[PDB]
Structures are given as C-alpha cells and as structure tokens.
Amino acid sequence: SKESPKRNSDKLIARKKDWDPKKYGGFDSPTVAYSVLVVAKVEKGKSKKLKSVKELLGITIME
DNA sequence: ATGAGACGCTGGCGATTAGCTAATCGCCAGCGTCTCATCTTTATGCGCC
C-alpha cells in the first residue's frame, strides 16, 4: 500500500500484528492486486436474511 | 545543393453532495327518519289422473 494517525475507519491496516489500527493508527489505501468475482449470500437488514449476491472482491497484494 | 522524426498521478481515500423506497402498524371508514303505494314469496291448513 501507500507508505504514509488513529481513526475510526476500517480502511486502516494494522502496522504490526497485535497493534490495533483503531488504538494506534495504521496504513491506508491498499493496492488491489487483482479483483475476484464472487457469488454467495450475506445477511441483510435487521432480520439478517441470506440474500444471493454477486460482486467484485478486492484482493490486495498483501492478501 | 536540409533540416523532421521521440508529448502528464492516478487511484485511493475522504468527504462532500445528492436522494429514496420500503416495512409496520394503526385508523377508520355518511347516516338519520318517515310517508305512500306496489308486488311477490314463505310456515301451516284441501283435491288422483
């Protein structure tokens, strides 16, 4: 990713293993190696219904 | 009787900027009368090809 503080976002990447980016701050903007087309089901709404969905998954270089 | 051909950070964020059905339930439903006549039809009661 890009090499450049703590924030309440999920885009932050843990700088070390146990170092939580929500309490320590971390990395940002991961470079997607290649996108993966997936098709399955996730929960949706307050009733958590499993609806069939298809979308593009972002596989970064680290991943 | 020499002087053209070879052209940028973008993607990955935030952060504006913009905009929309849908699922749940409740409420709450114009209505009041009379007159007048009019016809039916039903319950019971009575008769043999």
Side-chain angles (χ1 to χ4, degrees), chain A residues 1-21 24-40 42-43 45 47 50-63:
Chain A
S1 170
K2 288 188 178 181
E3 298 73 353
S4 303
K6 60 173 59 179
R7 199 201 301 169
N8 297 116
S9 178
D10 60 322
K11 297 298 183 58
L12 265 59
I13 304 306
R15 186 146 60 96
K16 290 318 284 162
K17 179 184 178 181
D18 307 329
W19 291 6
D20 177 41
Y24 295 101
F27 297 147
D28 63 322
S29 70
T31 301
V32 175
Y34 63 98
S35 181
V36 168
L37 179 155
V38 296
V39 193
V42 170
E43 298 179 353
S47 61
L50 292 181
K51 278 149 43 63
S52 88
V53 288
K54 68 173 192 303
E55 52 186 355
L56 300 177
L57 184 57
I59 296 300
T60 72
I61 300 178
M62 187 189 300
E63 294 174 348

